[PDB]
Amino acid sequence: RVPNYEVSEKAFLLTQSKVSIEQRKEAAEFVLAKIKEEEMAPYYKYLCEEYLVNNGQSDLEHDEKSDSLNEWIKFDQELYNELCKKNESKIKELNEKIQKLEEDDEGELEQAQAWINLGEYYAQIGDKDNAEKTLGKSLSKAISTGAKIDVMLTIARLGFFYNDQLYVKEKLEAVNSMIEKGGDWERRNRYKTYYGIHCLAVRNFKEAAKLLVDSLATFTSIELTSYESIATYASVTGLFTLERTDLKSKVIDSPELLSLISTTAALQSISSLTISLYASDYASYFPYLLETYANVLIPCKYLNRHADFFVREMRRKVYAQLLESYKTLSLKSMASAFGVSVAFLDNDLGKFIPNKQLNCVIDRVNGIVETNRPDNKNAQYHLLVKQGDGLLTKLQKYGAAVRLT
Amino acid sequence: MSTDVAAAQAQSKIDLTKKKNEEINKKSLEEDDEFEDFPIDTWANGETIKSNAVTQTNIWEENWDDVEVDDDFTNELKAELDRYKRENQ
Amino acid sequence: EFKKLDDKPSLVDVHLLESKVYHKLRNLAKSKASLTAARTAANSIYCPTQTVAE
Amino acid sequence: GDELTRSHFNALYDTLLESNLCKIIEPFECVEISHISKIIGLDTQQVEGKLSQM
Numbered sequence: 001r002v003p004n005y006e007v008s009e010k011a012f013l014l015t016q017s018k019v020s021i022e023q024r025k026e027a028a029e030f031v032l033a034k035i036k037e038e039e040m041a042p043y044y045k046y047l048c049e050e051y052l053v054n055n056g057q058s059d060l061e062h063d064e065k066s067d068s069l070n071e072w073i074k075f076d077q078e079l080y081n082e083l084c085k086k087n088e089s090k091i092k093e094l095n096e097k098i099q100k101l102e103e104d105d106e107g108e109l110e111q112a113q114a115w116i117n118l119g120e121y122y123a124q125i126g127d128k129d130n131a132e133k134t135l136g137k138s139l140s141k142a143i144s145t146g147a148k149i150d151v152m153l154t155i156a157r158l159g160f161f162y163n164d165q166l167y168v169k170e171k172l173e174a175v176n177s178m179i180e181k182g183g184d185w186e187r188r189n190r191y192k193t194y195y196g197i198h199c200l201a202v203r204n205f206k207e208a209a210k211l212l213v214d215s216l217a218t219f220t221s222i223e224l225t226s227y228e229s230i231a232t233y234a235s236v237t238g239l240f241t242l243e244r245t246d247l248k249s250k251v252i253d254s255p256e257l258l259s260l261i262s263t264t265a266a267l268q269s270i271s272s273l274t275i276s277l278y279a280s281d282y283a284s285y286f287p288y289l290l291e292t293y294a295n296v297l298i299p300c301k302y303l304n305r306h307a308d309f310f311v312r313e314m315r316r317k318v319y320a321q322l323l324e325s326y327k328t329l330s331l332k333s334m335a336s337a338f339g340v341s342v343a344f345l346d347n348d349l350g351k352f353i354p355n356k357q358l359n360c361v362i363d364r365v366n367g368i369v370e371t372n373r374p375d376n377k378n379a380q381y382h383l384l385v386k387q388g389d390g391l392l393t394k395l396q397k398y399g400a401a402v403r404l405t
Numbered sequence: 406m407s408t409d410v411a412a413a414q415a416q417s418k419i420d421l422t423k424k425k426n427e428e429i430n431k432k433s434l435e436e437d438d439e440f441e442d443f444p445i446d447t448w449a450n451g452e453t454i455k456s457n458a459v460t461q462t463n464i465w466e467e468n469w470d471d472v473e474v475d476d477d478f479t480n481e482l483k484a485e486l487d488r489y490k491r492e493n494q
Numbered sequence: 495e496f497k498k499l500d501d502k503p504s505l506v507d508v509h510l511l512e513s514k515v516y517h518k519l520r521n522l523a524k525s526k527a528s529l530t531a532a533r534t535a536a537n538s539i540y541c542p543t544q545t546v547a548e
Numbered sequence: 549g550d551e552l553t554r555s556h557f558n559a560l561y562d563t564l565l566e567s568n569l570c571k572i573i574e575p576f577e578c579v580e581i582s583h584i585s586k587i588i589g590l591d592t593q594q595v596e597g598k599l600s601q602m
Contacts, residue, residue: 261519307477308470308476405421
């Protein structure tokens with residue numbers, strides 16, 4: 001339970017090689033120690049899958065690639081023997097116990113428990129298939145609703161554990177159905193933190209934001225990553241969705257976030273960036289935009305997919321707020337504002353304005369930035385007609401279709 | 406394999422015994438199914454559908470990227486080089 | 495853990511201190527809850543002058 | 549010597565300013581920020597910066 005979310009993180013750094021060298025080597029050391037203790041060796045085979053002549057490979061059971069920057073990810077044959085030894089012993093000892101527990105009477109308690117213990121072992125060592133199958137029996141047997149929700153989060157943890165988003169998705173719909181059926185407040189909090197990280201892994205950050213602020217108020221340290229990691233995710237999403245007014249009220253109506261103060265490198269960078277946006281002084285914003293990429297998005301398992309997306313979106317957002325309150329700007333005063341140069345700025349702007357998603361124009365003769373964002377009724381009309389074009393379209397097709405058959 | 410929103414035409418039309426011949430005729434008129442001709446025709450299989458994360462298999466949502474070039478390396482070079490000019494100002 | 499070794503007026507001191515700590519972590523939710531508890535725990539009459547000043 | 553005065557003199561500057569500035573600008577449109585900076589008793593740049601937040 002506990003050590004699995006630790007290892008998967010640290011392994012994700014070795015799968016990449018864009019991460020700092022000291023970070024990657026220390027990460028290698030933590031995961032190797034836990035192969036001995038918790039038998040994370042079958043999980044070590046999964047890391048080679050993700051490569052094949054792609055970097056972060058130096059494997060001895062597989063193909064060793066010395067054109068790579070990782071060299072501490074040795075898949076020794078000392079490890080591989082240790083696996084076969086530990087694997088056999090544990091299956092033999094556990095089997096013998098469980099057979100005799102099933103034979104003694106009581107299906108409601110005993111036989112359900114005995115099979116759950118089978119799924120705990122296969123869950124622990126990173127065999128998904130055999131955990132699945134044995135824990136399917138546990139659910140079928142007459143057990144409380146709380147036990148089922150528990151086992152479902154345990155199966156879904158293995159999907160996080162392999163860092164495959166696909167496996168997780170299905171399992172969290174199963175809890176989403178069964179959480180209303182249990183009516184158990186205890187594990188309701190557990191659902192929120194799992195499901196927050198799933199919205200985070202997909203591009204739904206409006207939903208993630210609501211969940212990850214709630215994770216501050218109640219966190220659960222069983223099978224779930226650190227309180228500092230949950231704090232970092234809340235900050236990331238808060239900046240994404242919310243602009244000044246909404247964002248300021250979120251982190252001022254969030255006292256729990258504040259007690260935790262920044263106690264790790266990932267957390268600094270996002271927490272400092274928050275201050276600069278809603279205070280309306282983006283002087284520090286542009287250097288911090290780099291730092292947050294470096295220390296949040298690249299190391300995390302759930303934001304590396306969005307690493308490039310985040311910086312694209314945020315570059316619009318910060319500029320928009322300045323352009324909103326200013327009917328005119330000078331390129332030079334606006335260049336000073338971020339801490340950028342004049343020419344660099346035009347480039348970033350030259351991407352945002354054709355999709356017409358930022359609404360500004362730039363006189364390069366006068367040097368000024370005009371803002372053609374409508375702040376009147378013209379804006380409301382621009383919303384309305386594209387919905388009504390679609391309304392027309394939706395009825396044309398559904399109506400025509402039923403007449404024909 | 407469905408054209409626009411997959412569910413929008415899957416509910417819109419479904420099979421009938423009556424329609425089934427006419428449908429087959431439509432695909433034959435163009436002359437092929439035009440998704441199994443194309444690998445032979447080029448004499449390769451996909452690697453240029455591996456251009457972006459979203460292109461390969463849609464298991465995300467759209468970003469509106471189309472080259473997926475990290476923008477951190479360019480923003481870092483601007484940041485440092487600008488400071489130095491101001492330092493030498 | 496000192497509800498099994500409890501007769502003492504010495505937990506009044508601890509609640510008030512606790513609220514002060516929470517204030518400077520900048521979490522006022524449980525700073526307020528624990529202050530009330532300190533006030534109610536001081537509503538019984540035995541308390542020094544310093545204690546009320548705090 | 550006091551953390552607490554440093555906190556609430558931040559607050560004190562925002563409210564004293566906000567009352568002052570509203571009155572100066574009440575009957576004005578297209579008023580120069582150069583004109584405002586004299587009367588209010590603050591720097592030209594600071595005026596611009598306050599207005600943006602508001």
